[PDB]
A paper describes a structure:
Many pathogenic viruses rely on class I fusion proteins to fuse their viral membrane with the host cell membrane. To drive the fusion process, class I fusion proteins undergo an irreversible conformational change from a metastable prefusion state to an energetically more stable postfusion state. However, while both pre- and postfusion states are usually immunogenic, the labile prefusion state has been demonstrated to induce a more potent immune response in multiple viral families. To address these limitations, we developed a general computational approach where the protein’s sequence is optimized for the conformation of interest (here, the prefusion state) while destabilizing the other conformation in silico.
A similar scenario was observed in the [name] F variant M-104, which increased the melting point of its base construct by approximately 6.5 °C. M-104’s melting temperature (61.5 °C) was equivalent to [name] F variants containing up to two non-native disulfides, such as the DS-CavEs protein28 (62.7 °C). The crystal structure of the variants R-1b and M-104 verified their prefusion conformation at a resolution of 3.1 Å and 2.4 Å, respectively. The accuracy of our computational predictions was reflected in the high structural similarity between the determined structures and the computational models, with root-mean-square deviations (RMSDs) of only 1.193 Å (405 Cα atoms) for R-1b and 0.53 Å (416 Cα atoms) for M-104. The crystal structures of R-1b and M-104 revealed that introduced substitutions followed their predicted stabilization mechanism by filling cavities or increasing intra- or interprotomer hydrogen bonds and salt bridges. Especially precise agreement in rotamer orientation between our computational models and the experimental data was found in cavity-filling mutations, such as E60F in R-1b and the A159L and V203I in M-104. Significant alignment in rotamer orientation was also observed in substitutions strengthening polar interactions, such as the N380K in R-1b and the L130D, V430Q, and V449D in M-104. However, for [name], the M-104 construct incorporates four surface-exposed substitutions (A90N, L130D, V430Q, and V449D) that merit closer examination. Based on our estimation of per-residue energy changes, it is plausible that the mutation V430Q could be omitted from the M-104 design since its prefusion-stabilizing effect is only moderate compared to the other mutations (per-residue energy change of -2 REU, versus -5.8, -4.6 and -3.9 REU for A90N, V449D, and L130D, respectively).
Numbering used by the authors:
A (entry chain G), C (entry chain G), E (entry chain G): 103 to 471
B (entry chain F), D (entry chain F), F (entry chain F): 19 to 92
The structure:
C-alpha cells in the first residue's frame, strides 16, 4: 500500500460530509422556523436541532433595521434623488456585508472554502469559540490564535427565507492540545560499488502525533501546519499506526515493524529541509555546497548523505539550486550507524520498488540468490 | 525542539512539538435579515440610492439560484 | 499503469489550451476591430470569429458614459475640488467594476481561476447560458444552477485597446445531463492467518458515467462534484474504460477484466465514507465503534471489514478519529460473498504491489510455487 | 440512490446518480469601455475626485503590463 | 524512485522556510526599531538586517497623516456627526488599504498566498523589482511582466508595533533568463499480439531547463508556467539530472541512461496534448477522430499511437471526449523508429510496473526465461 | 518552437523555449502607519465617521491576534 495515496483527500471529504449533513437538518422549513423563533428576543441563542446536535444561533439585523427604520421613511412616493446623501452613503455601508456574502456564495456555488470577515466578524468568531464543547485550555489557545480557527473552517448556504439569508459556519474544534508530535524527513541513501548503485529512501516521512493511547501518521503536506512549537493537524487526515512504528527511527534494518521504503539502482541528489537543518543527498554528477548569508560559500560537501545544521549554515545548494535553512533554535544530535544501503551489493539489488516494507527488499535479494 | 539525524537511513526525526488537533466541528448558524427591500421602488431615474438598492435587490435574487445541496428544478 | 496519475491535471491543461487558443484568434487587431464594429449599435451581439468559432459579444459602457457625459463636464479647467460630491460618490460607484477587474487580472497574470461578479454579472451569465449551443433541458438546468456554471469557468485578458478593456470568459457547456453515474468506494480487505496478513485494496475508486455508448472513469477527486442526485464531471478529466469494467463490482476474482488492486502484507485500518454509509476496515491494534448524535456510542465493531449504514449510525470512529456519516436517503443492500483476500495464504503472498491487475497477483502466487 | 456493499472486496457501489457533463466551452467576449480618463487632469491639489480618477488611471496603466499569452518586450 | 513524488511540495516548503526565517530576524524589537529609524526621513530605504541580508524598506503613511492632520482636528470633543461628510468619505478612502490588508492577513493566519494590490501597489512593485540584485536584462523582463512577479510572491505579517503595521513581501528574483528549456509529453505505447498486450509509458514527462552547466527536470504541473516562448520555473521545484538524460529522446531502448517507464498488460486510450499538436493513443474499445472548427470531423484515426499537428486539426476526440489543440506556430518533425513496445512478446511480458528504469523491464523478461 | 514526435516511444519533445528561473527572493519590508486612532472616541451616537473609525479600531485590534510564527500565549 501507499499510505499517502490512501489518506489523500480524506479530511476534505469528511469535513464536507459533516457540514452537508448538518445543513440537511437545518434546511427543513420547521427547523428554520424554530431558529427564527429562538432569535426573536436576542441576537445570540444556543439551541439543539431536531437531529440532536447543539449549535449556536446568531442574528444579523443591521441592514434590515436601516431599511425599515431609515431608508423606507426617506423614500416617500418612490422618489430617490433626495438631497440627503448621508442616506446614500449609509446604505452603501449597511449593505456591504450582505453584498459580500452574496459574492462569496455565488462564486463557490454555496460552499465557501474558508470563513471571510463577512461570514463571521472577529466578535462573532470569539463568541463561537467561547461556546465550543471543549475545555478551558483548548478554548484559550483557540481564542488567542483564532485566525487559525478561521482558516480551517468554511461556510455553507442554507437558503433565503423571506428577506432572511440563512447560512452556517463550521468552526474547527481543536479539542486536544499539547500532546507530543514529531516529524520525519529523509533523502535518498545510496551505496555505490564499481559504478553500480543500490539506493533506498524512507517512505514514512511526515508528521506523527499521539492522542488518547494511539499514534497517528499524517502522510500528506496539507494535513498539518506549524506555528512555532505547535502543529495543527486534522485528525481525519491521518492513519492510526502501531507504536512500534517508531522503531523505524531506531533499528530500521533489524526491526520487525514494516518500515516503508522505495528503492533505486540510480542515485537522486536532492535536499530535504528539516526543522533545524537539512539533509543533502549528493551523488556523482552534481556539486553541493553550504553557504552563509554573511561570508559566502563555506565548503563543498562530500558525496553521500550529509546532515547540515542551521547553525552550520544559512543555505545549502545543489549545483545552482539554493535552499534556505530555517532559523529555529534547538538541539541537534547525530545517531551514528552504518547506512543500511551500504550493506547492499549493487550487483544483486532488486528492481525499483515503490513503497514496500524494507524486509521485503532483503527477502527479494536472498530469494533471488 | 530536538532533532536527531539517523545516519543509518539518511533521515531526521525532530521531536518536541505540541499538537493542536482538530477533533470536531462546531456549527454557528447565521440569519442575516435584509429587510423588505423588494417593496421599494425608485421611479425618479438614476440616483445613488437607486443603484445601491438595485445592487441589493439583484444580489438578493441571485442568492436564491445558489444551492449547496439539491439541484433547483423550477 | 496508475490511471489516476495518468489523468491528473489533464482537464485543467485542456481547459487552458482551449481558452488560450481562442484568445490567440481574438487578440489580432483586425479581430478586435470587427468586434468593436459589431457592438457599435448594440450591447450584445453574436458573431463568428476568423477561425470559425461562434461567440457572444457584450459591451460594458457605463463607466465611459459617466466619464464622457458627467465627469468631464463637471471638471471645467482642471479643477476637481467641486462642491458636488454626488459627482465623487457616483464615480466611485461607476468605476468599481473596472477597478475590480484590474485587481483580478493583475493578481493572476491575465488568467483568472474563476468568474467573479465583476467579470460577468448575474444578468450577463444568464444571457450567455441561454445562447449556448445545446438543448433546452441542458440550458434550463444550467440557468437554474448557474452558480455552478460560474464556478467551473474562468477568464482571460485579451488586452487594452485605446480606452477599451477586452477580455473573454470561458463558460462550461454542460451538454449532456441525466445519464447514469455511479461511485465506487473501498477500504483495505485483510485476511490474517497465524499473525501474518494478506491484504488487498481496490484501486478503481471514484466516479463512472455513461455517455453516447461509452463509460468514462474519473479517478481523481477534483474531476467531479455532486449536488443532490446530480454529479458534475469534466469529460476531459476521465479515461474511457470498457463496459466490462463493471464486472469488478460483480465477480472480481473470476472476471477477465483487469480489476486494479494494491496489496500489502500488513493491515491498514481506516474509514471510507460512502454516500449512504461507511466502510470501516478495523484490524489488530485499533478500536472502532459507531455512535449516535443522540444516544452516544452504540457498539464496538468486530475486526475485519464492516459496512455501516447512515441509518445504523451517525458517526464511526477509529480510536479517537471521528467520521460523520451523511444524511442522504436511499436503499442499502449487501451482496454477500467470501472476501477474496481470505482465499490467500499469508505465507505465500507476494511483495507489496501498487495498482496491478488482480489476476497478476494470483499469477504471482502460483508462479512463485 | 441505491448503495450495494460488495462483501467480496470491502467496497461499495452507489448508483442512481444523474450526470451533468462538461462537453464544451462557450466564449463570451467583453469590451469594457473606460472612456477618455487620460485626458483628464486635476490641478487643484487633493480632492475626492482626484483620488478616484488617479485610481482609474493607474489601474488602466497597470493593466497593459498584464499578459496572458506573450511576454512583453518593450 | 518516483521522481515526481520526491519533488512534490518542495518548492512551496522551501519558499515558506525562506520567508519565515527572514521574518524571524525582522521580528526582534531592536530590528523593528532600526527599520523605523531608517524610514524617519524618507518613504523608501535600502538596509541590511542583523543577519546580513539586504532588504528594501517602504513606509506607508497616508492613513496616519489623514488621522493626525485632518480627522483629529474635525472631532473636537468626541463629536462625530459633523456636517462635512467629505471628512467621512475621505476616511473611507484613506483606510481601505489598511482594512484590506487586515482581511488578507486574518483569513490566512499571517501568510498570504500571493501579493494583493493592497500589500504592494503597482508603483511599489516596480521599485522593488528595480532594486533586485540581478542584471539589467532580468530586471527589464521582470518589470515588463511584473504581474508574474506578483503571482509567484507572497506576504508575511511581522506584527503590530504601536499604531504601525509591519509586514514583509517576498518577491521572486528571476535571476536567469533565456537558457534553453524543453518539454516531453507522452502517451501509452501498446503492442498487441493475439489479443494480449504489452504496453509502456514514458514517466519522464514535463519540463527540462539548463542553467550554469546542469539540466534540471521539473516533474510536476505547478512547477513551471509558460507565457509565449518563455517558461517560468521555480528552481527549488526541480531535480538535477544527468545531461545523458536527453538520450531517452534519442535511443530509449539502446541507451545506458535509466529511462523511466511504466508498463501494463492492458491498453489505455487517451490524448496527451503537446504544444504544437497532440498524441492520441487509440486502442481496441474506443473510437478516435480529428476535427476542424470549420469543416467538422476530418477523419477517424487508426488504432495505435498517432501524432496530430495543430495545422492538421483543431480538435481530437476519444469517443465523445473533445480536446482542443493549440494555435501556436512552429515546426513539426517526425523521428521515425520501430515502437519499442512492439519488440515485446505480450505472452512473456512482466507484471505491471510503476516508474522503473526501462532496462529493468528487459531484464525482467530475460531473467524470467 | 520545434516539436519532434518520437515514434519509438509515443512521445514528443518540444524545444525552443526560453527559461525564466526563480533563483532567489527579494524582501520588501513595509511599515504601514495607522495613526493614533485609539485615542479617538465618538460619543454622539451613530455617525458615518463613527462606523468608519470603529472598522479601523476593530481591524487594528484583530490584527494583533494574528501570528505567522509563534503561538500567542497571553
Ligand atoms: C529495536 O529497538 C527497540 C527499542 O530499543 C527494541 O525494543 C525494546 O526491546 C526490549 C527487548 O525485548 C524490551 O525490553 C523488555 O521490556 C519488557 C517491558 O514489559 C520487559 O518485560 C523485559 O524484561 C525487557 O526489559 C523493550 O521494552 C523494548 N522497548 C520498547 C520501547 O518497546 C526492539 O526490541 C529492537 N528490535 C530488534 C529486532 O532488535
Ligand atoms: C462475471 O459476471 C458477469 C455478469 O453477470 C458475466 O457476464 C455474463 O456472462 C453470460 C455468460 O456468457 C452472458 O450470457 C450470454 O449473453 C449473450 C448476449 O448476447 C447470449 O448470446 C448467451 O446465450 C448468454 O445468455 C451475459 O450476457 C453476461 N452479462 C453481461 C452483462 O455481459 C460474466 O460472464 C462473469 N465472468 C466470469 C468469468 O464468470
Ligand atoms: C545514443 O545516442 C547518443 C546521441 O547520438 C549517443 O551519444 C554519442 O555517442 C558517440 C559514440 O561514442 C559519441 O561520439 C564520440 O564523441 C567523443 C567526444 O569527446 C569523441 O572523443 C569520439 O571520437 C566520438 O566522436 C558522441 O559524442 C555522443 N553524443 C553525445 C551528445 O554525447 C550514444 O552513444 C547512443 N547510445 C548507445 C548505447 O548507442
Ligand atoms: C436612523 O433613524 C434613527 C431614528 O429612527 C436614528 O437614531 C439613526 O441615527 C438613523 N441612522 C441613520 C444612518 O440615518
Ligand atoms: C410588501 O411585501 C410583502 C412581502 O413580499 C408582500 O407580501 C406585500 O404584498 C407587500 N405589501 C406592502 C403594503 O408593501
Ligand atoms: C449624468 O448626466 C445626465 C444628463 O446628461 C443625467 O441624466 C444623469 O442623471 C447624470 N448622472 C449623474 C450620476 O450625475
Ligand atoms: C484626447 O485623448 C486622445 C486619445 O488619447 C488624444 O489622441 C488627443 O490628443 C487628446 N485631445 C484632446 C483635445 O483632449
Ligand atoms: C487635510 O488638511 C490639509 C491641511 O492641513 C489639506 O491640505 C488637505 O487637503 C486636507 N485633506 C482632506 C481630505 O480634507
Ligand atoms: C494617546 O495615546 C497614547 C498611545 O496609546 C497614550 O499613551 C496616551 O496616554 C494618549 N494621550 C493623549 C493625551 O491622547
Amino acid at each position: 500500500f501507499v499510505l499517502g495515496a490512501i489518506a489523500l483527500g480524506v479530511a476534505e471529504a469528511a469535513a464536507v460530509t459533516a457540514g452537508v449533513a448538518i445543513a440537511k437538518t437545518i434546511r427543513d422549513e420547521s427547523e428554520v422556523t424554530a431558529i427564527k423563533n429562538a432569535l426573536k428576543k436576542t441576537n445570540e441563542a444556543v439551541s439543539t436541532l431536531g437531529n440532536g446536535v447543539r449549535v449556536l444561533l446568531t442574528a444579523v439585523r443591521e441592514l434590515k433595521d436601516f431599511v425599515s427604520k431609515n431608508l423606507t421613511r426617506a423614500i416617500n412616493k418612490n422618489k430617490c434623488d433626495i438631497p440627503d446623501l448621508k442616506m446614500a452613503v449609509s446604505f452603501s455601508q449597511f449593505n456591504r456585508r450582505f453584498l459580500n456574502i452574496v459574492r462569496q456564495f455565488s462564486d463557490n456555488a454555496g460552499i465557501t472554502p474558508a470563513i471571510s470577515l463577512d461570514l463571521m466578524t472577529d466578535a462573532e468568531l470569539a463568541r463561537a469559540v467561547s461556546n465550543m464543547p471543549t475545555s478551558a485550555g483548548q478554548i484559550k489557545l483557540m481564542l488567542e490564535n483564532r485566525a487559525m480557527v478561521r482558516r480551517k473552517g468554511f461556510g455553507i448556504l442554507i437558503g433565503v427565507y423571506g428577506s432572511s439569508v440563512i447560512y452556517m459556519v463550521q468552526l474547527p474544534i481543536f479539542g486536544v492540545i499539547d500532546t507530543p508530535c514529531w516529524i520525519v524527513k529523509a533523502a535518498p541513501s545510496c551505496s555505490e560499488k564499481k559504478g553500480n548503485y543500490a539506493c533506498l529512501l524512507r517512505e514514512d516521512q511526515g508528521w506523527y502525533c499521539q492522542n488518547a493511547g494511539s499514534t497517528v501518521y499524517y502522510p500528506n503536506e496539507k494535513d498539518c501546519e506549524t506555528r512555532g512549537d505547535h502543529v495543527f493537524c486534522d485528525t481525519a487526515a491521518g492513519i492510526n499506526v502501531a507504536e512500534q512504528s517508531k522503531e523505524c527511527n531506531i533499528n530500521i534494518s533489524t526491526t520487525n515493524y514494516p518500515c516503508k521504503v522505495s528503492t533505486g539502482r540510480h542515485p537522486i541528489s536532492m535536499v530535504a529541509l528539516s526543522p533545524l537543518g537539512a539533509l543533502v543527498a549528493c551523488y556523482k554528477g552534481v556539486s553541493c555546497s553550504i553557504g552563509s548569508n554573511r561570508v559566502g560559500i563555506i565548503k563543498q560537501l562530500n558525496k553521500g548523505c550529509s546532515y547540515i545544521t542551521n547553525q552550520d549554515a544559512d543555505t545549502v545548494t545543489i549545483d545552482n539550486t539554493v535552499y534556505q535553512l530555517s532559523k529555529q533554535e534547538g538541539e541537534q544530535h547525530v545517531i551514528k550507524g552504518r547506512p543500511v544501503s551500504s550493506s547492499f551489493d549493487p550487483d544483486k539489488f532488486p528492481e525499483d520498488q515503490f513503497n514496500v516494507a524494507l524486509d521485503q527488499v532483503f527477502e527479494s535479494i536472498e530469494n533471488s540468490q | 525542539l530536538k532533532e536527531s539525524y539517523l545516519e543509518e537511513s539518511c533521515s531526521t526525526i525532530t521531536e518536541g512539538y505540541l499538537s493542536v488537533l482538530r477533533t470536531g466541528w462546531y456549527t454557528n448558524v447565521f440569519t442575516l435579515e435584509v429587510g423588505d427591500v423588494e417593496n421599494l421602488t425608485c421611479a425618479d431615474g438614476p440616483s445613488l440610492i437607486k443603484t445601491e438598492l438595485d445592487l441589493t435587490k439583484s444580489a438578493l435574487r441571485e442568492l436564491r439560484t445558489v444551492s449547496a445541496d439539491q439541484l433547483n428544478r423550477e
